[PDB]
Short mmCIF file of C-alpha atoms in Angstrom, two decimals:
data_model
loop_
_atom_site.label_atom_id
_atom_site.label_comp_id
_atom_site.label_asym_id
_atom_site.label_seq_id
_atom_site.Cartn_x
_atom_site.Cartn_y
_atom_site.Cartn_z
CA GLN A 730 34.70 -17.76 -28.42
CA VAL A 731 36.28 -14.59 -29.68
CA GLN A 732 37.19 -12.25 -26.83
CA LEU A 733 38.73 -8.79 -26.52
CA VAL A 734 39.37 -7.60 -22.94
CA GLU A 735 40.55 -4.03 -22.38
CA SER A 736 42.46 -2.55 -19.45
CA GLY A 737 44.40 0.59 -18.53
CA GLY A 738 41.70 3.24 -18.41
CA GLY A 739 41.37 5.80 -15.69
CA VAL A 740 42.10 9.43 -14.94
CA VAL A 741 45.13 11.19 -16.41
CA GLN A 742 46.18 14.84 -16.29
CA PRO A 743 46.36 16.89 -19.53
CA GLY A 744 49.74 16.59 -21.21
CA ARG A 745 50.51 13.22 -19.67
CA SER A 746 50.61 9.76 -21.22
CA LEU A 747 48.56 6.61 -20.77
CA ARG A 748 48.69 3.12 -22.32
CA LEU A 749 45.63 0.95 -22.97
CA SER A 750 45.85 -2.78 -23.54
CA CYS A 751 43.45 -5.15 -25.29
CA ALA A 752 44.03 -8.88 -24.67
CA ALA A 753 42.65 -11.11 -27.43
CA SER A 754 41.51 -14.73 -27.13
CA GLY A 755 39.57 -17.23 -29.22
CA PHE A 756 41.20 -16.59 -32.60
CA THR A 757 44.58 -16.42 -34.32
CA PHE A 758 45.47 -12.86 -33.33
CA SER A 759 48.29 -12.42 -35.85
CA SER A 760 45.85 -13.18 -38.74
CA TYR A 761 43.78 -10.04 -38.15
CA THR A 762 44.25 -6.30 -38.36
CA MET A 763 42.97 -4.28 -35.40
CA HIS A 764 41.67 -0.81 -34.50
CA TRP A 765 40.91 1.52 -31.66
CA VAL A 766 37.64 3.46 -31.77
CA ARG A 767 36.44 5.95 -29.20
CA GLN A 768 33.20 7.49 -28.03
CA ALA A 769 33.02 10.69 -26.03
CA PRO A 770 30.16 10.67 -23.53
CA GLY A 771 26.82 11.13 -25.27
CA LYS A 772 28.46 11.32 -28.70
CA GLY A 773 29.04 9.02 -31.66
CA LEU A 774 31.79 6.63 -32.68
CA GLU A 775 35.13 8.05 -33.88
CA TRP A 776 37.77 5.83 -35.49
CA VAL A 777 41.14 6.42 -33.76
CA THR A 778 43.74 4.11 -35.26
CA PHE A 779 44.49 1.00 -37.34
CA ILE A 780 47.37 -1.50 -37.25
CA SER A 781 48.17 -4.18 -39.83
CA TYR A 782 48.77 -7.89 -39.22
CA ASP A 783 52.45 -7.66 -38.18
CA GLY A 784 52.46 -4.01 -37.11
CA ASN A 785 54.32 -2.72 -40.19
CA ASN A 786 51.55 -0.32 -41.19
CA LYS A 787 49.81 2.06 -38.81
CA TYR A 788 47.13 4.64 -39.58
CA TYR A 789 45.75 7.41 -37.36
CA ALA A 790 42.87 9.83 -37.33
CA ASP A 791 43.87 13.49 -37.79
CA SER A 792 42.70 14.43 -34.32
CA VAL A 793 45.36 12.15 -32.72
CA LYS A 794 48.14 12.17 -35.32
CA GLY A 795 51.57 12.70 -33.75
CA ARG A 796 50.19 12.07 -30.25
CA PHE A 797 48.97 8.42 -30.24
CA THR A 798 50.87 5.29 -31.24
CA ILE A 799 49.30 1.89 -31.86
CA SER A 800 51.28 -1.31 -31.39
CA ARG A 801 50.79 -5.04 -31.03
CA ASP A 802 52.62 -8.02 -29.50
CA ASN A 803 51.55 -11.07 -31.47
CA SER A 804 53.36 -13.50 -29.16
CA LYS A 805 51.32 -12.16 -26.22
CA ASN A 806 48.09 -11.74 -28.27
CA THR A 807 47.91 -8.13 -27.11
CA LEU A 808 47.03 -4.81 -28.76
CA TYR A 809 48.22 -1.50 -27.26
CA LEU A 810 47.31 2.17 -27.58
CA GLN A 811 49.98 4.55 -26.28
CA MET A 812 48.45 8.00 -25.78
CA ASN A 813 50.77 10.98 -25.31
CA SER A 814 50.14 14.72 -24.86
CA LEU A 815 46.58 13.98 -23.76
CA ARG A 816 43.87 16.64 -23.97
CA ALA A 817 40.55 17.16 -22.22
CA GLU A 818 38.73 16.36 -25.47
CA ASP A 819 40.35 12.89 -25.59
CA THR A 820 38.06 11.98 -22.67
CA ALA A 821 36.06 9.03 -23.98
CA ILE A 822 35.27 5.34 -23.86
CA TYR A 823 38.01 3.55 -25.84
CA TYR A 824 37.16 0.28 -27.67
CA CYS A 825 39.42 -2.17 -29.45
CA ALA A 826 37.91 -3.81 -32.53
CA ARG A 827 38.94 -6.65 -34.85
CA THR A 828 38.73 -6.26 -38.64
CA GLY A 829 36.80 -9.09 -40.27
CA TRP A 830 38.56 -10.65 -43.22
CA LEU A 831 35.94 -9.02 -45.46
CA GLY A 832 36.51 -5.59 -43.91
CA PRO A 833 33.93 -4.71 -41.19
CA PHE A 834 34.65 -4.34 -37.45
CA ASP A 835 33.18 -7.71 -36.48
CA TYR A 836 34.16 -7.93 -32.76
CA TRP A 837 34.53 -5.14 -30.23
CA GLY A 838 35.92 -4.99 -26.72
CA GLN A 839 33.62 -3.72 -24.02
CA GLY A 840 35.51 -0.44 -23.70
CA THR A 841 37.36 1.41 -20.94
CA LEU A 842 36.82 5.00 -19.80
CA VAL A 843 39.69 7.49 -20.08
CA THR A 844 39.14 10.81 -18.31
CA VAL A 845 41.61 13.61 -19.07
CA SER A 846 41.40 16.25 -16.34
CA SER A 847 43.50 18.02 -13.72
CA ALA A 848 40.73 17.70 -11.09
CA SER A 849 41.33 15.81 -7.89
CA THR A 850 39.61 12.60 -6.92
CA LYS A 851 36.90 13.74 -4.47
CA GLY A 852 33.90 12.01 -3.02
CA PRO A 853 30.60 13.85 -3.44
CA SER A 854 28.73 16.11 -1.06
CA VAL A 855 25.18 14.79 -0.80
CA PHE A 856 22.43 17.35 -0.27
CA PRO A 857 18.72 16.49 0.13
CA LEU A 858 15.99 17.51 -2.29
CA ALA A 859 13.32 17.59 0.38
CA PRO A 860 9.66 17.00 -0.53
CA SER A 861 7.12 19.76 0.12
CA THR A 862 2.06 11.99 -5.02
CA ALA A 863 5.35 13.71 -3.99
CA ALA A 864 8.86 14.02 -5.42
CA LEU A 865 12.05 13.92 -3.33
CA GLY A 866 15.69 13.22 -4.11
CA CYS A 867 19.42 13.61 -3.53
CA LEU A 868 21.78 16.11 -5.17
CA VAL A 869 25.17 14.39 -5.49
CA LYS A 870 27.50 17.34 -6.04
CA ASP A 871 31.20 18.04 -6.66
CA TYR A 872 32.71 14.58 -7.13
CA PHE A 873 35.43 13.38 -9.49
CA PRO A 874 35.81 11.29 -11.54
CA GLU A 875 32.80 9.44 -12.94
CA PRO A 876 31.00 7.18 -12.08
CA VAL A 877 28.79 7.24 -8.94
CA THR A 878 25.95 4.83 -8.26
CA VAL A 879 22.81 5.80 -6.35
CA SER A 880 20.30 3.47 -4.72
CA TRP A 881 17.34 4.19 -2.45
CA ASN A 882 16.66 2.57 0.93
CA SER A 883 19.54 0.14 0.23
CA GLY A 884 17.80 -1.17 -2.88
CA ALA A 885 14.35 -1.69 -1.34
CA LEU A 886 13.02 1.37 -3.26
CA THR A 887 13.33 1.06 -7.03
CA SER A 888 9.93 2.02 -8.48
CA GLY A 889 9.68 5.62 -9.67
CA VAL A 890 13.42 6.33 -9.26
CA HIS A 891 15.19 8.46 -11.87
CA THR A 892 18.95 8.87 -11.54
CA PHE A 893 19.99 11.48 -14.10
CA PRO A 894 23.25 11.58 -16.10
CA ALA A 895 25.85 13.71 -14.37
CA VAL A 896 26.83 17.08 -15.78
CA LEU A 897 30.43 18.35 -15.78
CA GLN A 898 30.58 21.74 -14.08
CA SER A 899 32.96 24.55 -14.98
CA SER A 900 34.90 23.71 -11.78
CA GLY A 901 35.84 20.36 -13.32
CA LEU A 902 33.69 18.36 -10.88
CA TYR A 903 30.55 16.38 -11.66
CA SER A 904 27.05 16.79 -10.22
CA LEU A 905 24.02 14.55 -10.58
CA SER A 906 20.55 14.29 -9.11
CA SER A 907 18.56 11.20 -8.19
CA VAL A 908 14.85 11.60 -7.52
CA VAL A 909 11.91 9.37 -6.65
CA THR A 910 8.14 9.91 -6.65
CA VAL A 911 6.29 8.31 -3.72
CA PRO A 912 2.81 8.49 -2.19
CA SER A 913 2.28 11.73 -0.31
CA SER A 914 0.83 9.59 2.49
CA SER A 915 4.14 7.89 3.28
CA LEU A 916 5.89 11.16 4.15
CA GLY A 917 6.46 11.01 7.90
CA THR A 918 5.70 7.27 7.90
CA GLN A 919 8.48 5.91 5.63
CA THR A 920 12.06 7.11 5.77
CA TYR A 921 13.89 7.76 2.51
CA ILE A 922 17.65 7.32 2.31
CA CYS A 923 19.78 7.60 -0.79
CA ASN A 924 22.96 5.48 -0.82
CA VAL A 925 25.76 6.95 -2.96
CA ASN A 926 28.82 4.88 -3.88
CA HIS A 927 31.78 6.72 -5.43
CA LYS A 928 33.95 3.80 -6.26
CA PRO A 929 36.93 5.86 -7.65
CA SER A 930 37.40 7.62 -4.31
CA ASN A 931 36.21 4.53 -2.37
CA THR A 932 33.59 6.65 -0.62
CA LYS A 933 30.11 5.64 0.52
CA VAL A 934 27.56 8.17 1.75
CA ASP A 935 24.01 7.66 3.02
CA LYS A 936 21.76 10.72 3.13
CA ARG A 937 18.34 10.71 4.74
CA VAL A 938 15.84 13.05 3.05
CA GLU A 939 13.17 14.62 5.25
CA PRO A 940 10.17 16.92 4.51
CA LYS B 1457 39.19 7.29 -58.22
CA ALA B 1458 37.98 4.41 -55.98
CA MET B 1459 39.26 0.89 -55.35
CA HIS B 1460 38.17 -1.86 -57.75
CA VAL B 1461 39.20 -5.51 -58.00
CA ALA B 1462 38.56 -7.64 -61.10
CA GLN B 1463 39.01 -11.40 -61.40
CA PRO B 1464 37.57 -14.06 -63.76
CA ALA B 1465 34.11 -15.49 -63.22
CA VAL B 1466 35.13 -19.14 -63.66
CA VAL B 1467 38.28 -21.20 -64.11
CA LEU B 1468 38.76 -24.92 -64.55
CA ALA B 1469 41.51 -26.47 -62.48
CA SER B 1470 43.74 -28.73 -64.55
CA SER B 1471 43.99 -32.49 -64.14
CA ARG B 1472 47.18 -31.64 -62.28
CA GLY B 1473 44.89 -29.96 -59.74
CA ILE B 1474 46.32 -26.49 -60.43
CA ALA B 1475 44.20 -23.44 -61.22
CA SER B 1476 45.48 -20.06 -62.37
CA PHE B 1477 43.73 -16.71 -62.62
CA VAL B 1478 44.59 -13.03 -62.94
CA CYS B 1479 43.51 -10.59 -60.25
CA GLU B 1480 43.89 -6.94 -61.17
CA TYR B 1481 43.09 -3.84 -59.19
CA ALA B 1482 42.56 -0.18 -59.91
CA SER B 1483 43.39 2.53 -57.38
CA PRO B 1484 43.14 6.33 -57.33
CA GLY B 1485 46.91 6.54 -56.96
CA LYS B 1486 50.02 4.37 -57.16
CA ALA B 1487 50.56 2.09 -54.18
CA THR B 1488 54.00 0.73 -53.39
CA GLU B 1489 53.10 -1.78 -50.67
CA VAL B 1490 50.30 -4.22 -51.51
CA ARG B 1491 49.06 -7.24 -49.56
CA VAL B 1492 47.18 -9.89 -51.56
CA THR B 1493 45.03 -12.48 -49.78
CA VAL B 1494 43.09 -15.31 -51.41
CA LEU B 1495 39.95 -16.15 -49.45
CA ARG B 1496 37.55 -19.06 -49.85
CA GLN B 1497 33.87 -18.16 -49.46
CA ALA B 1498 31.54 -21.03 -48.49
CA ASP B 1499 28.10 -20.11 -47.09
CA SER B 1500 29.33 -16.87 -45.42
CA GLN B 1501 32.12 -18.84 -43.67
CA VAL B 1502 35.45 -17.63 -45.16
CA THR B 1503 38.90 -19.20 -44.82
CA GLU B 1504 42.31 -17.91 -45.85
CA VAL B 1505 44.02 -19.74 -48.69
CA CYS B 1506 47.25 -17.74 -48.92
CA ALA B 1507 48.62 -14.24 -48.52
CA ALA B 1508 51.67 -12.26 -49.61
CA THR B 1509 53.07 -8.78 -49.17
CA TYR B 1510 54.50 -7.18 -52.21
CA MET B 1511 56.43 -4.09 -53.23
CA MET B 1512 55.56 -3.40 -56.83
CA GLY B 1513 58.48 -4.13 -59.15
CA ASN B 1514 60.06 -6.50 -56.61
CA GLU B 1515 58.30 -9.82 -57.46
CA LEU B 1516 55.55 -11.48 -55.42
CA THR B 1517 56.65 -14.30 -53.10
CA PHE B 1518 54.37 -16.11 -50.64
CA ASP B 1519 54.17 -20.83 -50.34
CA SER B 1520 53.26 -24.51 -50.36
CA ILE B 1521 49.95 -23.78 -52.06
CA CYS B 1522 50.02 -20.43 -53.88
CA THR B 1523 52.53 -18.97 -56.29
CA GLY B 1524 52.19 -15.56 -57.87
CA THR B 1525 53.72 -13.21 -60.36
CA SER B 1526 53.25 -9.46 -60.54
CA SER B 1527 52.93 -7.12 -63.51
CA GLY B 1528 51.79 -3.55 -62.93
CA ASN B 1529 48.36 -3.67 -61.30
CA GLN B 1530 47.93 -7.37 -62.18
CA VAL B 1531 48.72 -10.40 -60.05
CA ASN B 1532 48.80 -13.80 -61.77
CA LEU B 1533 47.89 -16.30 -59.03
CA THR B 1534 48.39 -20.06 -59.18
CA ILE B 1535 46.76 -22.35 -56.61
CA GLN B 1536 48.10 -25.94 -56.49
CA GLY B 1537 46.97 -29.09 -54.69
CA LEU B 1538 43.29 -28.67 -55.56
CA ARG B 1539 41.45 -31.91 -54.95
CA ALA B 1540 37.67 -32.43 -54.99
CA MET B 1541 36.45 -30.59 -51.89
CA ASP B 1542 37.97 -27.29 -53.01
CA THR B 1543 35.48 -26.46 -55.77
CA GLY B 1544 34.18 -23.10 -54.64
CA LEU B 1545 34.44 -19.33 -54.73
CA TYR B 1546 37.92 -17.84 -54.27
CA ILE B 1547 37.92 -14.11 -53.52
CA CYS B 1548 40.84 -11.87 -54.37
CA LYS B 1549 41.50 -9.36 -51.58
CA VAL B 1550 43.94 -6.51 -52.15
CA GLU B 1551 45.05 -4.10 -49.43
CA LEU B 1552 46.95 -0.98 -50.46
CA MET B 1553 49.06 -0.43 -47.35
CA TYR B 1554 51.31 2.51 -48.32
CA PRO B 1555 51.42 5.40 -49.25
CA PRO B 1556 48.23 6.58 -47.57
CA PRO B 1557 45.32 6.34 -47.94
CA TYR B 1558 44.91 2.70 -47.07
CA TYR B 1559 42.49 0.98 -49.47
CA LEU B 1560 40.68 -2.33 -49.10
CA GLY B 1561 39.57 -4.06 -52.28
CA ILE B 1562 37.50 -7.25 -52.38
CA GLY B 1563 36.96 -9.03 -55.68
CA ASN B 1564 33.71 -10.66 -56.69
CA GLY B 1565 35.25 -14.14 -56.54
CA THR B 1566 36.39 -16.78 -59.02
CA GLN B 1567 34.41 -20.01 -59.08
CA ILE B 1568 37.13 -22.68 -59.25
CA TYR B 1569 35.86 -26.03 -60.51
CA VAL B 1570 38.06 -29.05 -59.79
CA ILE B 1571 37.47 -32.39 -61.57
CA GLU C 962 37.44 11.95 -45.88
CA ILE C 963 34.15 10.17 -46.76
CA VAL C 964 31.46 11.85 -44.65
CA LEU C 965 28.40 9.72 -43.85
CA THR C 966 25.14 11.47 -42.99
CA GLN C 967 22.36 9.43 -41.44
CA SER C 968 18.71 10.32 -41.31
CA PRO C 969 16.50 10.84 -39.61
CA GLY C 970 18.30 11.79 -36.38
CA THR C 971 15.57 10.06 -34.35
CA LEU C 972 12.89 7.59 -35.56
CA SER C 973 9.88 7.36 -33.26
CA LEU C 974 7.96 4.16 -33.95
CA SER C 975 5.71 1.77 -32.15
CA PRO C 976 6.78 -1.85 -31.46
CA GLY C 977 5.89 -4.12 -34.35
CA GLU C 978 6.20 -1.36 -36.98
CA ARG C 979 8.66 -1.23 -39.87
CA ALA C 980 11.78 0.96 -39.51
CA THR C 981 13.72 2.44 -42.46
CA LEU C 982 17.08 4.16 -41.84
CA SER C 983 19.12 6.05 -44.46
CA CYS C 984 22.85 6.59 -44.83
CA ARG C 985 24.16 9.02 -47.49
CA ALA C 986 27.86 9.25 -48.37
CA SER C 987 29.64 12.39 -49.63
CA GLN C 988 31.27 10.29 -52.35
CA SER C 989 30.81 6.80 -53.76
CA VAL C 990 31.36 3.87 -51.41
CA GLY C 991 31.60 0.44 -52.96
CA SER C 992 28.73 -1.76 -51.68
CA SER C 993 31.39 -4.19 -50.42
CA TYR C 994 32.56 -1.48 -47.95
CA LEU C 995 29.42 -0.40 -46.09
CA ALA C 996 28.50 -1.68 -42.60
CA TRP C 997 25.76 -1.06 -40.08
CA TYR C 998 26.24 -1.33 -36.30
CA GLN C 999 23.78 -1.37 -33.42
CA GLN C 1000 24.51 0.18 -29.98
CA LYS C 1001 22.50 0.08 -26.75
CA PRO C 1002 23.34 2.37 -23.80
CA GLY C 1003 26.23 1.06 -21.72
CA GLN C 1004 27.29 -1.50 -24.34
CA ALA C 1005 29.83 -1.68 -27.12
CA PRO C 1006 28.66 -1.53 -30.75
CA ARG C 1007 27.66 -4.79 -32.47
CA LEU C 1008 28.11 -5.50 -36.17
CA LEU C 1009 24.70 -6.02 -37.83
CA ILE C 1010 25.24 -5.81 -41.59
CA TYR C 1011 28.37 -5.71 -43.81
CA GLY C 1012 28.93 -5.51 -47.54
CA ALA C 1013 25.72 -3.43 -47.52
CA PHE C 1014 23.47 -6.56 -47.62
CA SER C 1015 25.07 -9.43 -45.63
CA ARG C 1016 23.98 -10.16 -42.06
CA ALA C 1017 26.63 -10.92 -39.48
CA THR C 1018 26.43 -14.34 -37.83
CA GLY C 1019 23.45 -14.67 -35.51
CA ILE C 1020 21.77 -11.43 -36.63
CA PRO C 1021 18.03 -12.13 -37.16
CA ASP C 1022 16.52 -11.95 -40.64
CA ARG C 1023 14.19 -9.03 -39.81
CA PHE C 1024 17.33 -6.86 -40.37
CA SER C 1025 18.20 -6.24 -44.05
CA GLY C 1026 20.41 -3.78 -45.89
CA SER C 1027 20.20 -2.36 -49.37
CA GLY C 1028 21.66 0.42 -51.50
CA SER C 1029 24.75 1.31 -53.47
CA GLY C 1030 26.93 4.22 -54.57
CA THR C 1031 26.18 6.99 -52.08
CA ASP C 1032 22.78 5.85 -50.81
CA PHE C 1033 22.18 2.98 -48.36
CA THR C 1034 19.19 1.76 -46.39
CA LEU C 1035 18.83 -0.35 -43.21
CA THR C 1036 15.38 -1.91 -42.81
CA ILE C 1037 13.94 -3.60 -39.75
CA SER C 1038 10.80 -5.29 -40.96
CA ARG C 1039 9.11 -5.43 -37.53
CA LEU C 1040 10.60 -3.69 -34.49
CA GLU C 1041 11.07 -5.99 -31.53
CA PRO C 1042 11.63 -4.55 -28.00
CA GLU C 1043 15.39 -5.20 -28.19
CA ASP C 1044 15.68 -3.27 -31.48
CA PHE C 1045 15.15 0.14 -29.91
CA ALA C 1046 18.68 1.49 -29.95
CA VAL C 1047 21.18 3.64 -31.88
CA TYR C 1048 22.32 2.53 -35.36
CA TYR C 1049 25.54 3.66 -37.07
CA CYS C 1050 26.60 3.21 -40.65
CA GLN C 1051 30.31 3.00 -41.47
CA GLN C 1052 32.50 2.81 -44.55
CA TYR C 1053 35.52 0.55 -44.19
CA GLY C 1054 36.96 0.68 -47.72
CA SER C 1055 39.62 3.37 -47.13
CA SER C 1056 41.28 5.42 -44.38
CA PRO C 1057 40.19 7.22 -42.38
CA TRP C 1058 37.45 4.75 -41.43
CA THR C 1059 34.37 6.89 -40.91
CA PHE C 1060 30.99 6.51 -39.20
CA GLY C 1061 27.65 8.20 -39.64
CA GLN C 1062 26.50 10.27 -36.68
CA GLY C 1063 23.88 7.72 -35.61
CA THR C 1064 20.10 7.27 -35.78
CA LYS C 1065 18.22 6.63 -32.55
CA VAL C 1066 15.19 4.35 -32.85
CA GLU C 1067 12.85 5.34 -30.02
CA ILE C 1068 9.52 4.06 -28.68
CA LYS C 1069 6.60 6.16 -29.79
CA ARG C 1070 3.81 6.46 -27.22
CA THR C 1071 1.00 8.92 -26.53
CA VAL C 1072 1.87 12.50 -25.61
CA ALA C 1073 2.48 12.87 -21.86
CA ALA C 1074 2.95 16.20 -20.13
CA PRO C 1075 5.71 16.47 -17.51
CA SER C 1076 4.86 16.83 -13.88
CA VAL C 1077 7.08 19.76 -12.78
CA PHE C 1078 8.68 20.19 -9.34
CA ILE C 1079 11.08 22.81 -8.03
CA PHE C 1080 13.54 22.36 -5.12
CA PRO C 1081 15.18 25.30 -3.38
CA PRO C 1082 18.76 24.96 -2.13
CA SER C 1083 19.05 22.84 0.97
CA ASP C 1084 20.06 24.53 4.22
CA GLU C 1085 23.24 22.42 4.34
CA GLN C 1086 24.36 23.61 0.90
CA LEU C 1087 23.65 27.25 1.72
CA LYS C 1088 25.75 26.84 4.87
CA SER C 1089 28.57 25.64 2.61
CA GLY C 1090 28.32 28.87 0.55
CA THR C 1091 26.65 27.83 -2.74
CA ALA C 1092 23.05 27.46 -3.94
CA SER C 1093 21.73 24.89 -6.45
CA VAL C 1094 18.07 25.25 -7.50
CA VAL C 1095 16.69 22.09 -9.11
CA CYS C 1096 13.79 21.79 -11.54
CA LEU C 1097 12.48 18.28 -12.23
CA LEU C 1098 10.34 17.44 -15.30
CA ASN C 1099 8.98 13.97 -14.58
CA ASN C 1100 7.75 11.34 -17.07
CA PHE C 1101 6.98 13.18 -20.29
CA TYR C 1102 6.80 12.32 -23.97
CA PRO C 1103 8.04 13.30 -26.56
CA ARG C 1104 11.58 14.27 -25.66
CA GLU C 1105 11.46 17.91 -26.83
CA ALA C 1106 11.14 20.23 -23.87
CA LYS C 1107 12.22 23.70 -22.88
CA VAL C 1108 13.17 24.83 -19.37
CA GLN C 1109 13.65 28.54 -18.73
CA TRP C 1110 14.81 29.86 -15.36
CA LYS C 1111 13.52 33.18 -14.02
CA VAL C 1112 14.95 35.00 -10.96
CA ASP C 1113 12.71 37.95 -9.92
CA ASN C 1114 11.10 37.53 -13.35
CA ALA C 1115 14.39 38.04 -15.26
CA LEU C 1116 15.32 35.29 -17.68
CA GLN C 1117 18.56 33.50 -16.84
CA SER C 1118 21.27 32.48 -19.29
CA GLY C 1119 24.51 30.52 -18.94
CA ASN C 1120 24.10 29.56 -15.27
CA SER C 1121 22.11 26.31 -15.61
CA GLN C 1122 22.80 22.74 -16.77
CA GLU C 1123 20.39 19.98 -17.84
CA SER C 1124 20.36 16.21 -17.93
CA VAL C 1125 17.80 13.74 -19.43
CA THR C 1126 17.22 10.05 -18.69
CA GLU C 1127 16.96 7.30 -21.25
CA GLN C 1128 13.46 6.29 -22.27
CA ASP C 1129 11.80 4.62 -19.28
CA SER C 1130 11.72 0.82 -19.48
CA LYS C 1131 8.09 0.58 -18.33
CA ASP C 1132 6.18 3.65 -19.61
CA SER C 1133 8.56 4.88 -22.38
CA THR C 1134 8.71 8.44 -20.97
CA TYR C 1135 11.63 10.81 -20.39
CA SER C 1136 12.56 12.79 -17.32
CA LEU C 1137 14.72 15.92 -17.18
CA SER C 1138 16.61 17.54 -14.31
CA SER C 1139 17.87 21.13 -14.59
CA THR C 1140 20.14 22.85 -12.05
CA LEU C 1141 20.55 26.62 -11.70
CA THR C 1142 23.73 27.35 -9.74
CA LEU C 1143 24.25 30.67 -7.99
CA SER C 1144 26.63 31.81 -5.38
CA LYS C 1145 25.04 32.24 -1.99
CA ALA C 1146 25.39 36.04 -2.02
CA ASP C 1147 23.67 36.21 -5.40
CA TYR C 1148 21.00 33.77 -4.32
CA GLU C 1149 20.23 36.02 -1.36
CA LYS C 1150 19.95 39.14 -3.55
CA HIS C 1151 16.64 37.89 -5.05
CA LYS C 1152 13.25 36.63 -3.97
CA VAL C 1153 11.31 34.72 -6.67
CA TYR C 1154 12.91 31.65 -8.25
CA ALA C 1155 10.85 30.10 -11.06
CA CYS C 1156 11.15 27.23 -13.52
CA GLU C 1157 9.04 27.72 -16.70
CA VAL C 1158 8.50 24.56 -18.75
CA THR C 1159 7.25 24.36 -22.33
CA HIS C 1160 6.13 20.97 -23.66
CA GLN C 1161 3.75 19.63 -26.29
CA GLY C 1162 1.51 17.99 -23.68
CA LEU C 1163 0.87 21.33 -21.92
CA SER C 1164 -1.72 23.71 -23.36
CA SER C 1165 0.49 26.58 -22.16
CA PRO C 1166 3.93 26.69 -20.46
CA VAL C 1167 3.83 25.84 -16.74
CA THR C 1168 5.73 27.86 -14.14
CA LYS C 1169 6.69 26.39 -10.79
CA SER C 1170 8.21 28.88 -8.36
CA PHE C 1171 9.02 29.73 -4.75
CA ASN C 1172 10.23 32.67 -2.68
CA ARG C 1173 13.34 32.63 -0.47
#
């Protein structure tokens, strides 16, 4: 089984450098050319860079030319992307992909997130969206970086839950909301707690939401 | 203007078990580094026969199975050792590596019959 | 650069129906150099079709490709539940490798109006010095919707942000959350905070509001 496992993603400040790796298994690595492709959040696929079988020929997209370098170590079955002079707009999921012998990108890694930002790693502040069929929720504000996960009543409440994509505020921190619709009758009878996990800052917060 | 690869529809391998065919390509510009790969197509499963990298005007050297000569945009390929199982479709693949742009060219295939 | 333009941007179809997706290239692409990829949210792309017509290994035969020159078509003869997803065409015959901008294949269902709720800033947040007003549009279809914020009946611009869920797994609806952010001092200069929602399932735009 063909396999492409990426590592090295994370948060990096603008202007700095960061190296991604893609470890290949299940095929003769040196017999294939390889690429990196990226996808900014909510956007399409953008080809980044190409490297030939033995690394003697390298091609780059114009948006990264002179800043990114592709390389490969065929004895370690590993592909690398060295990113220099990073910019906010390089923030994206980065995928490695193998070129089929007939040309298409026939296998892709599962991707790693690179966030370019000067913001500091902060857990979120969790404010209630109190009810007043009823809707209630949690506003998970001012955290960095992505992602956070939200559950309700430690996973016992899943029906009618909507956890929205975060937005990036002008401060550089993210905010999301998670809401749930429940029977009006249960207000005062059932307690509603949203459980936020911000794995990048290793923070867990439980917030009880009351009428 | 775009990449094209031409190769013969059919060739008969000799009794010596050697088959030769010309593979020629057309490109918008003039490449100076070219990689030629011979592929075998058999029910969507493709295997590599041989491959060589090649600066034009510097002779094309691979071996053990394929020899080649170069002349302008033409590559005369010779495949040796053909037995009985190797009757099939042999695709000429040409990659123009430098100067940019990179171009990939895939021929339509040569049906090689071995007797 | 060979620019690929896909259409339509979004196809809304019921399960079991036939889907036709177009990819147009700004200059000729050899048929041998055209691929189609499928992508679901949270997953990497998957090769579906290459050489314009050939299915990748394991891709089911309801997927087929056609076309040549500058004009290519991906057909799904009957949509199965797993086929609702984003599809990208790509040319891989010369650098730079380029992709179309994607076509989303979405579940069509009956029109559903949003249920609209508004949430004032919490007391805790106000104590911290900022105010976020949240407007929730719950379980609507189709996706097109407009939220306008009004503060003392003046339309707001540039001080709100929106987010929309993926199509719901059970009822195929969307939900939208919009946040108006004001400083506390500005929040306390005004009385009426209103969220006005326009959507096809509503005979006229609905306003939800509250007073400080």
